[PDB]
């Protein structure tokens, strides 16, 4: 059909059709007369997977012969989504498979919709891991993703009576054709036990053993014939485990529970034992694998051959585990082992929210990992000795910088352990990296200024342009060719088309087609009727007080009250769509979902409103729903309180896909606005500086309520039961929080938000100028490619050169 | 190499080699330089599985078009063993795969040794199920095996210090290439709840739902291109299950535990809830499948289209479940539903041991299956009304025949439920079926004499001759051709070779080769040195008091005491091998293993004995060890107390493979002796009649101890610590049982056993006459083919004609 989807050669199509029928027969043991769409999806998945195998074996072979420096990306989360379309895109197979499926009488797009998301992450951090794997493969880096093969990923979200219900994400029920079990590379992981001290040093004894079985998933680079590995560990019990008889076999599940379920909290630490077991399990199995590979290339060369990147503190135990292996098992002296550990490890910080920072109780580490606690205390003593020598007499600094926090319960500050044990610490957007140096890590910065870097986040333009928005990919490729897909900076060439009438028409046409296709998707799968000629106002991201879905709710209720006051006045029609999951135990996030649906129940059924205002809660927001709604969006809502959103990556997805942004100067929004120009961005609200000034004098919500009549009306509607007729007091927790305990200062940004939202409506009245501003955004989105991000990690942290040069086919 | 293994055509071998390299690359994602024997076994397994697929799809297709009567074999146990060699044998692929593997530089026999046994049974009953599936496929019957896909089969047996230790049989760790998951045919199974009575009859409500997911394994017939299905159910939780959040996901394991582990008791009932859940789970999922198939062919035709065979009482709930579906869901009247149920169901009884008969407490059925208890009580009332009408005033008969047993706890007698609900009840050897009519089922026989049949057990000559003993298969095929493999009665033609010198030499040569090959297997895998010129005295079967391993131990200690008394006299050298697992909770069986190893520790290290007497405990006796030792045996020990071994099938395996039998007139031993001639069999001991006569007057073990000096010496050796120097009283439980509480009358058969064992030694001194007696046994083993057994089930119970006619290829 379209050029960027590759060639449909006669030999290629014939060969794909024959392998599809071979897999249907031999692999699936189905004849054509009883095969379901699911059988057809699986036959296609096996057929495309076949094109990976040769490339995967050769790539791993090449890394054994060349022995380059190896990058190990340790994450507890990989938010992968679907693999089929991504594999076809990266192997240039998409048009050939479309053609081959069409000739067998099937619709490939309908087969793609059958694949389950690999939902092994919560949101931004897990999805950053997935974008990074794709960029590392595209840039020809000898990179490995290491994590946990959770049996249940992020829960499926159902809305029942406007409330979130959670269902188990049984993503493996029908099998995973993309993973290969490697039961032969199964490794032991130790828990509990005690430390004996001998003449020959410390010994960890009387441990419980859990086996880690690896599952390898291929990670294809963009048309470079490179296929890297994501290795995920599954927990298995040993066969002597608990070995009356029946109960001993049934109790094997205590051990296998380690890899059973992803913790579903975004930016919230829960100090549970099972979570600490998950953290050690991935770190222990992964470091044995790293060391095995290194010994098949003394430990002085380890950091020339190994980089370990820590995705937040979740795998921070990699630092004491590497010390334990180097000191206790390899018998290196402390100082040499520490040198190797620091040069090997690098720490990416993703948050400043205090309740998200990992602080493990000592009694927990004492029971589960006694030797790691000893090594952590030893790290702390030698670290505090360097602090004392550099800042003599500064006793408050010693208390603040300690890895051990004193109090009710002693805690380990895992962030402090990562800075001490890493040669590089980075934040994930320039303002976030500046805030790390000025606030939470100020003391560490003053000791070791050299460790602190910025690596601004990015997104892969493969999944987030070519895959989700082929029509936009194509009109761009019509003008400037295909090269931009692996060199996004080339999109700047689009600034010379900002006054080209045909290009303006094509950009608006693709947006309109994406909106029709998504409006129809809503009708088919969830029986809801939306005006496709309305402005698509989209806020999709996890439900969080800091992301201020509530600020958006206040705007929606304002528009509603303005329509009801002046029913017969023109307003730009909007479809306001909000989606995201709340953590199951996060009461306020569950109330916010319920408020969103309750506003919808009132606004969507008022005949005076008509099709001028619609409020839709998008159910089960996940990677595959993001691929559908983001290409359909006109307005991107990035409205976090200044200083709370470390980066965001949603923001980038929307910029790439032809939506204008309304946002605060938070996270990468600052850099997006700098790249596009402030005049091409709907910036409103407090800067970081303004929030600090408000904090010094005290945030009084009552002040905003007394001075803004439009705001007081909304709070009185909420209180009195305007939106909950049967349960008048349903939303009292929301009102009470907005009036007395709002950490994120929702009212402080209300006036400037509504005014700025009026400026959005005004520009939307002028299609041509709206589209010209969209072109200025797409044209300057190049910086926000994960290829740029990874090239910066490679050069400035890992010490390796990226390469766009192809392996042979 | 040998003819019965089929042709190695040039095109066939070339094609197998190419598919083996295709599977190594594409399926296993290995290059030849890192592949292990396990990778090579898997590549071969995938290559042979490919030859099944076409035949499997066509067979199932043929059954849909022809719509023949369908046979459903319901068993809680299928003791399958390894699949690779069996598949090759049945598809005539063995020589072609040997050749193809040889040319790729691999040894196929070494690859076969890598396959795990499917150990989803305890012993004879589970293995009878497996032999039956093979015969049903060979006789072209539209037959389905239905059971449970246990995650852990019968435990792996380790001997540590002469004691049995159990290890979890993790048979699925490396994957099962033979099964195909069918997650699309997943069915709900209900537990707990309560019964509401409405106007429209009884309703089972507020149940817990467990999902049953089927896994299909192919069952190939012998070169007839027929491939039947064994369908095994796995327990899965629904996704709303328990739906704080984390614990709800972890608690999914309560539901999935149903299919986790095979109960490891042979001939011992344990009334545990988890076991009752296993029984309902297979019956509920299976009857929904049977009914779905039937409705794609009113219920008057059900029994013309459906036979359900119950493998003992373990699936007895099939009877009330079919009533429940027919009465509660299909709305048939009681009498019509009952007619259909009786004509559909048939019950095979396998035991008379009281502690093996299933008697479920009512409080258990009341909680778990409330509606099935109501239906069982209703069955009992109408059954007892027919008993009362036939035997008016016979109130004791009413109490004895009741499905409900009164007492401390009310129990359901599941055997009584099966006779009432079945058109046919059979035992498994003629003497066993006679004992059913005279003792435990006398009352039922007098009511419905027509229901009671014999179907003498058999073994498949595919696994138990061609597969395990190719050299014997071949010398037979040299004289009489290959036809006997699917018509074992043809072995009678071997009686015309009983005086042929060349055939005598070939039979003795194959036995000698099998003994060398097994002696070498012992040395490699378990570092033990055996005289291959000795008589191989083998007792392999589950460890049980009724099977009298202890009688054998007394003989071994007698030979030892006779050697020590007269060291310089000639005795026929023996290797005495005993193997079998004890149920983990069966104290006395664990002591017997320990006694066997303790005798070995004394006998094997006495320099005066030399290589004249060896006692070996064969570790981890299972189907794959039976395939090795049974072809190596000279003497088969079948020494159960008369009336206790319902049939036995080991006995038959050994008769087929060229061992003479020493045994009691028990089980199929009676029929084996009748077929071969009493003069060609080492018969000793009490008949059933003699045991009864002893029971009437009282079994006094002291009488035998007072009169047999050789016996008194052994009991004094056992007591005093001759065999346990460090723990003098180790075996007091054994002595105490033999002297005061022996239900199986070990001493009563001692004298006649030793005398008969002297007759065995005497014939072994004359190789030619030993071999001539072996030929008379092999020659008359035809009756004991499972093809004969299944043809009898088909004609006399199921109402279908077997067929040896091939499906097209
Ligand atoms: O850099 C990628 C994105 O990372 C997000 C993040 C920070 N912390 C977490 C997180 C996730 C899971 C956690 C689980 C347990 C404990 C803390 C946990 C913190 N996620 C951050 O909010 C967003 O601005 C960035 O764009
Ligand atoms: O007909 C095949 C063979 O079946 C054997 C049998 C009888 N009962 C059981 C058994 C097995 C498992 C059980 C599990 C639970 C409760 C009772 C259980 C009874 N197994 C029988 O001893 C042998 O003579 C026959 O040759
Ligand atoms: O001893 C070896 N000989 C040849 N190739 C090897 C050897 N060890 C590893 N390789 C190759 O290196 C790849 C990577 O293995 P890994 O690094 O252990 O995951 C393997 O799949 C092989 O292709
Ligand atoms: O509706 C149908 N059309 C054609 N073939 C069918 C149909 N239903 C079942 N079959 C065939 O019958 C086989 C047995 O299916 P089962 O009896 O449901 O396990 C299937 O695998 C098909 O080959
Ligand atoms: C990109 C993405 C996110 C992160 O979005 P933010 O707006 O940065 O919070 C979360 N969830 C999914 C499914 C995503 O694709
Ligand atoms: C045949 C067989 C049995 C049954 O043997 P019996 O001597 O009849 O008890 C038990 N276990 C295995 C592994 C078998 O192959």
Annotate B493-521 with DSSP letters as a single string. GGGGGTT-HHHHHHHHHHHHHHHHHHHHH
Chain B, nearest residue to A258 by Cα: B250
Q: Using an 8 Å Cβ cutoff, are A464 and A472 in contact?
A: no
CA A550 to ligand 5 centroid distance, Å: 18
Residues of A in contact with B170 (CB under 8 A): 239
| Cα–Cα distance, B210 to B234 (Å, whole number) | 10
Single out the residue of B399, B369, B363, B373 nearest to residue B384, CA to CA.
B399
User: Active-site residue B272, yes or no?
Assistant: no
| Cα–Cα distance, B714 to B595 (Å, whole number) | 13
CA A296 to ligand 3 centroid distance, Å: 9
Resolution, expressed in angstroms to one decimal:
2.3
Atom of ligand 5 nearest to the CA of A580: 11
* Backbone φ and ψ of A160, nearest 5°: -125, 110
Residue whose CA is at the smallest distance from ligand 6 atom 11:
B123
**Nearest-ligand number for the alpha carbon of A457:** 1
Is residue A98 marked as binding? no
Catalytic residue among B371, B416, B547, B612: B547
Residues 6+ apart with CB under 8 A from B483: B490
- CA-to-CA separations, B608 to B567, B571, B602, B614, B754, in angstroms, rounded: 7, 13, 11, 12, 22
SS3 B570: coil
Interface list for B 194-223 with A (CB within 8 A): 216
Structure tokens, B361:
């407490």
Strand ranges (E), A273-410: 306-311, 345-348, 359-361, 404-405
Q: Using an 8 Å Cβ cutoff, are B748 and B643 in contact?
A: no
Q: Using an 8 Å Cβ cutoff, are A165 and A248 in contact?
A: no
| Cα–Cα distance, B146 to B75 (Å, whole number) | 6
- CA-to-CA separations, A659 to A414, A515, A539, B593, B804, in angstroms, rounded: 39, 12, 12, 77, 72
Residue whose pair of structure tokens reads 């053609």 in the numeric block: A99
Single out the residue of B627, B654, B632 nearest to residue B113, CA to CA.
B627
Radius of gyration, alpha carbons of chain B: 27
Does A37 contact B at CB distance below 8 Å? no
Catalytic residue among B324, B653, B776, B783: B653
Q: What is the least distance, in Å, from the CA of B32 to any CA of chain A?
A: 11
| Cα–Cα distance, B377 to A487 (Å, whole number) | 78
- CA-to-CA separations, A565 to A558, A609, B184, B421, in angstroms, rounded: 10, 11, 55, 77
Is residue B31 marked as binding? yes
CA B160 to ligand 2 centroid distance, Å: 28
Q: How many other CB atoms are there within 10 angstroms of residue A206's CB atom?
A: 9
Structure tokens, B84:
């690779």
User: Residue-wise over B1-22: b if at least 16 C-beta within 10 A, else e?
Assistant: eeebbbebeeebbebbbebbee
Residues 6+ apart with CB under 8 A from B216: A29, B179, B180, B182, B229, B230, B231
- CA-to-CA separations, B59 to A33, A763, B141, B219, B809, in angstroms, rounded: 15, 68, 11, 11, 10
Q: How many other CB atoms are there within 10 angstroms of residue B109's CB atom?
A: 10
Beta carbons of B585 and A245 less than 8 Å apart: yes
Beta carbons of B168 and A253 less than 8 Å apart: no
Is residue A394 marked as binding? no
- CA-to-CA separations, B658 to B456, B512, B771, in angstroms, rounded: 21, 11, 8
| DSSP code per residue over A193-223 | EEEEEETTEEEEEEEEEEEEEEEEEEEE-SS
Interface list for A 254-313 with B (CB within 8 A): 257, 260-261, 263-264, 272, 274
Torsion of CA A507, A513, A514, A518, to 10 degrees: 160
Q: Which helix (H) or strand (E) holds A471?
A: helix A470-480
| Cα–Cα distance, A413 to A407 (Å, whole number) | 13
Beta carbons of B245 and A165 less than 8 Å apart: no
Q: What is the least distance, in Å, from the CA of A737 to any CA of chain B?
A: 25
Q: Which helix (H) or strand (E) holds A445?
A: helix A442-447
| Cα–Cα distance, B458 to B127 (Å, whole number) | 10
CA A298 to ligand 3 centroid distance, Å: 21
Q: Using an 8 Å Cβ cutoff, are B682 and B774 in contact?
A: no
Structure tokens, B666:
């028990």
Q: Using an 8 Å Cβ cutoff, are B311 and B75 in contact?
A: yes
What is the distance in angstroms between the CA of the first residue and the CA of the last residue of chain B?
Answer: 25
Q: How many other CB atoms are there within 10 angstroms of residue A449's CB atom?
A: 9
Ligand 4 probe mutation, A31, A34, A36, most atoms within 8 A of CB: A34
DSSP character for A152? B
- Is the shortest distance between the CB of B31 and ligand 3 below 6 Å? yes
Q: How many other CB atoms are there within 10 angstroms of residue B167's CB atom?
A: 16
Q: Using an 8 Å Cβ cutoff, are B346 and B796 in contact?
A: no
| Cα–Cα distance, A179 to A116 (Å, whole number) | 14
Q: How many other CB atoms are there within 10 angstroms of residue A1's CB atom?
A: 11
What was the elucidation method? X-ray
| Cα–Cα distance, B662 to B758 (Å, whole number) | 11
Q: Using an 8 Å Cβ cutoff, are A171 and A116 in contact?
A: yes
DSSP character for A27? I
Strand ranges (E), A104-236: 118-120, 143-148, 156-160, 163-167, 180-181, 187-198, 201-220, 227-236
Ligand 4 probe mutation, B61, B64, B71, most atoms within 8 A of CB: B64
Beta carbons of A175 and B181 less than 8 Å apart: yes
| Cα–Cα distance, B379 to B333 (Å, whole number) | 14
Is residue B296 marked as binding? yes
- CA-to-CA separations, B558 to A73, A242, B402, in angstroms, rounded: 70, 40, 49
Q: Which residues pair with B217 in a beta bridge?
A: B230
Of B26, B156, B173, the CB nearest to A183: B173
Burial class (CB in 10 A: 0-12, 13-18, 19+), A803: middle
| Cα–Cα distance, A146 to A76 (Å, whole number) | 8
Residues of A in contact with B243 (CB under 8 A): 165-168
| DSSP code per residue over B765-794 | T-HHHHHHHHHHHHTT-GGGBHHHHHHHHI
| Cα–Cα distance, A211 to A235 (Å, whole number) | 6
Residues 6+ apart with CB under 8 A from A758: none
| Cα–Cα distance, B543 to B550 (Å, whole number) | 10
Q: Pairing mode, if any, of strands B424-427 and B452-454?
A: parallel
Catalytic residue among B649, B771, B780, B789: B649
Interface list for B 218-247 with A (CB within 8 A): 236-237, 239-241, 243-246
Chain B, nearest residue to A50 by Cα: B26
| Cα–Cα distance, B379 to B422 (Å, whole number) | 12
H helical segments located in B91-182: 94-103, 108-112, 124-138
Query: What residues of A are annotated to the active site?
Result: 350, 541-542, 547, 649, 653
**Phi-psi region at A751: left, alpha or beta (left = phi > 0; alpha = psi -120 to 50):** alpha
- CA-to-CA separations, B81 to A196, B45, B696, in angstroms, rounded: 46, 15, 44
Q: Using an 8 Å Cβ cutoff, are A746 and A738 in contact?
A: yes
Beta carbons of B25 and A54 less than 8 Å apart: yes
Q: Which residues pair with B241 in a beta bridge?
A: none
Residues in chain B, total = 809
H helical segments located in B609-668: 623-629, 650-656
All structural domains of chain B? 1-458+786-809 (3.40.50.2000), 459-785 (3.40.50.2000)
DSSP character for A785? B
SS3 A579: strand
Sign of the C-alpha dihedral, residues B724, B726, B728, B732? negative
CA B64 to ligand 4 centroid distance, Å: 6
Residues in chain B after which the chain is broken, C→N over 2.5 Å: 243, 297
| Cα–Cα distance, B763 to B760 (Å, whole number) | 5
Single out the residue of A774, A535, A772 nearest to residue A660, CA to CA.
A774
SS3 B194: strand
Catalytic residue among B541, B544, B574, B745: B541
Q: What is the least distance, in Å, from the CA of B294 to any CA of chain A?
A: 17
Q: What is the largest CA-CA distance in chain A?
A: 89
- CA-to-CA separations, A468 to A127, A136, B218, in angstroms, rounded: 15, 21, 42
Q: Which residues pair with B561 in a beta bridge?
A: none
CA angle B606, B612, B616 (to 5 degrees): 75
Structure tokens, A96:
């050939």
CA B503 to ligand 3 centroid distance, Å: 54
Residues of B in contact with A584 (CB under 8 A): 244-245
Question: How many C-alpha atoms does B182 have within 13 Å on its Cβ side?
Answer: 20
Catalytic residue among B350, B372, B432, B515: B350
- 3-state SS string over B60-85? HHHHHHHCCCEEEEECCCEEEECCHH
- CA-to-CA separations, A456 to A316, A682, A790, A795, in angstroms, rounded: 21, 21, 10, 14
Residues of B in contact with A272 (CB under 8 A): 246
H helical segments located in A663-796: 669-676, 688-697, 701-707, 709-720, 732-740, 750-764, 767-778, 786-793
DSSP character for B150? -
| Cα–Cα distance, B423 to B375 (Å, whole number) | 19
For chains A and B, count residue pairs whose Cβ atoms are closer than 8 Å: 107
Beta carbons of B183 and A173 less than 8 Å apart: yes
| Cα–Cα distance, B381 to B366 (Å, whole number) | 18
* Backbone φ and ψ of B383, nearest 5°: -65, -50
Beta carbons of A261 and B249 less than 8 Å apart: yes
Q: Using an 8 Å Cβ cutoff, are A537 and A662 in contact?
A: no
| Cα–Cα distance, A640 to A648 (Å, whole number) | 10
* Backbone φ and ψ of A790, nearest 5°: -70, -40
* Helices B414-421 and B370-390, axial angle in degrees (round to 10): 70
Structure tokens, A409:
């319960």
Q: Which helix (H) or strand (E) holds A461?
A: helix A461-461
Q: How many other CB atoms are there within 10 angstroms of residue B562's CB atom?
A: 15
Residues of B in contact with A61 (CB under 8 A): 31
Burial class (CB in 10 A: 0-12, 13-18, 19+), A402: middle
Single out the residue of B676, B623, B616 nearest to residue B649, CA to CA.
B623
Ligand 5 probe mutation, A77, A118, A124, A627, most atoms within 8 A of CB: A124
| Cα–Cα distance, A278 to A189 (Å, whole number) | 11
SS3 B532: coil
| Cα–Cα distance, B530 to B523 (Å, whole number) | 8
SS3 A233: strand
SS3 A762: helix
Q: Using an 8 Å Cβ cutoff, are B575 and B530 in contact?
A: yes
- CA-to-CA separations, B641 to A7, B273, B699, in angstroms, rounded: 78, 33, 13
**Nearest-ligand number for the alpha carbon of A623:** 5
């Amino acid at each position: 059909q379209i050029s960027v989807r590759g060639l449909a050669g006669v030999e290629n199509v014939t060969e794909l059709k024959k392998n599809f029928n071979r897999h249907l027969h031999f692999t699936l043991v189905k004849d054509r007369n009883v095969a379901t769409p699911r059988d057809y999806y699986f036959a296609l998945a096996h057929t495309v997977r076949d094109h990976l195998v040769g490339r995967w074996i050769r790539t791993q072979q090449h890394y054994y012969e060349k022995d380059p420096k190896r990058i190990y990306y340790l994450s507890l989360e990989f938010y992968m989504g679907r693999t089929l379309q991504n594999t076809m895109v990266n192997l240039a197979l998409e048009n050939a498979c479309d053609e081959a499926t069409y000739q067998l009488g099937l619709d490939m797009e309908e087969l793609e919709e059958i694949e389950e998301d690999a939902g092994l992450g919560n949101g931004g951090l897990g999805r950053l891991a997935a974008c990074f794997l794709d960029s590392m493969a595209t840039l020809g880096l000898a990179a490995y993703g290491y994590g946990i093969r959770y049996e249940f990923g992020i829960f499926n979200q159902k809305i029942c009576g406007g409330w979130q219900m959670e269902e188990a994400d049984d993503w493996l029920r029908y099998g995973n054709p993309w993973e290969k079990a490697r039961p032969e590379f199964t490794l032991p992981v130790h828990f509990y036990g005690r430390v004996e001290h001998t003449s020959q040093g410390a010994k960890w004894v009387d441990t419980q053993v859990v086996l880690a079985m690896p599952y390898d998933t291929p990670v294809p680079g963009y048309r470079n014939n490179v296929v890297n590995t994501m290795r995920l560990w599954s927990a298995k019990a040993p066969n002597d485990f608990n070995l009356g008889y029946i109960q001993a076999v049934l109790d094997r599940n205590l051990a296998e529970n380690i890899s059973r379920v992803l913790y579903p909290n975004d930016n919230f630490f829960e100090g549970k034992e099972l979570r600490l077991k998950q953290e050690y399990f991935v770190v222990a199995a992964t470091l044995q694998d790293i060391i095995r590979r290194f010994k098949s290339s003394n430990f002085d060369a380890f950091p020339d051959k190994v980089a370990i990147q820590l995705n937040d503190t979740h795998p921070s135990l990699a630092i004491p585990e590497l010390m334990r292996v180097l000191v206790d098992l390899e018998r290196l002296d402390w100082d040499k082992a520490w040198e190797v550990t620091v040069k090997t490890c690098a720490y990416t910080n993703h948050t400043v929210l205090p309740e998200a920072l990992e602080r493990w109780p000592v009694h927990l580490l004492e029971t589960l990992l006694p030797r790691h606690l000893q090594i952590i205390y030893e790290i702390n003593q030698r670290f505090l000795n360097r602090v004392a020598a550099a800042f003599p007499g500064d006793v408050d600094r010693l208390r603040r910088m300690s890895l051990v926090e004193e109090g009710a319960v002693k805690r380990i500050n895992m962030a402090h352990l990562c800075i001490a044990g890493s040669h590089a610490v980075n934040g994930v957007a320039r303002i976030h990296s500046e805030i790390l140096k000025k606030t939470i890590f100020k003391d560490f910065y003053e000791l070791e200024p050299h460790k602190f870097q910025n690596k601004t986040n990015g997104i892969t333009p493969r999944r987030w342009l070519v895959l989700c928005n082929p029509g936009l990919a194509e009109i761009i490729a019509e003008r400037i060719g295909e090269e931009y897909i692996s060199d996004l900076d080339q999109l700047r060439k689009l600034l010379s088309y900002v006054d080209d009438e045909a290009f303006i028409r094509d950009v608006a046409k693709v947006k309109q087609e994406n909106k029709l296709k998504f409006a129809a998707y809503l009708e088919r799968e969830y029986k809801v009727h939306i005006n496709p000629n309305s402005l698509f106002d989209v806020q999709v991201k996890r439900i969080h007080e800091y992301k201020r879905q509530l600020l958006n709710c206040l705007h929606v209720i304002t528009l509603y009250n303005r329509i009801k006051k002046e029913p017969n006045k023109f307003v730009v029609p909007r479809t306001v769509m909000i989606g995201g999951k709340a953590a199951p135990g996060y009461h306020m996030a569950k109330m916010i979902i319920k408020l969103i649906t309750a506003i919808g129940d009132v606004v969507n059924h008022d005949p005076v409103v008509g099709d001028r205002l619609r409020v839709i809660f998008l159910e089960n927001y996940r990677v595959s729903l993001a691929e559908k709604v983001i290409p359909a969006a006109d307005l991107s809502e990035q409205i976090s309180t200044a200083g709370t959103e470390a980066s965001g990556t949603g923001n980038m997805k929307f910029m790439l896909n032809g939506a204008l942004t309304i946002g605060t100067m938070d996270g990468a929004n600052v850099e997006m606005a700098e790249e596009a120009g402030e005049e091409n961005f709907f910036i409103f609200g407090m800067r970081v500086e303004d929030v600090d000034r408000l904090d010094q004098r005290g945030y009084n919500a009552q002040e905003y309520y007394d001075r803004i009549p439009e705001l007081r009306q909304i709070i009185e509607q909420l209180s009195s039961g305007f939106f909950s007729p049967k349960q008048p007091d349903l939303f009292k927790d929301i009102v009470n929080m907005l009036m007395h305990h709002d950490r994120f200062k929702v009212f402080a940004d209300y006036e400037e938000y509504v005014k700025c939202q009026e400026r959005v409506s005004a520009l939307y009245k002028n299609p041509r100028e709206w589209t010209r501003m969209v072109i200025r955004n797409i044209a300057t989105s190049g910086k926000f490619s994960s290829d740029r991000t990874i090239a910066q990690y490679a050069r400035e942290i890992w010490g390796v050169e990226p390469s766009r040069q192809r392996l042979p086919a």
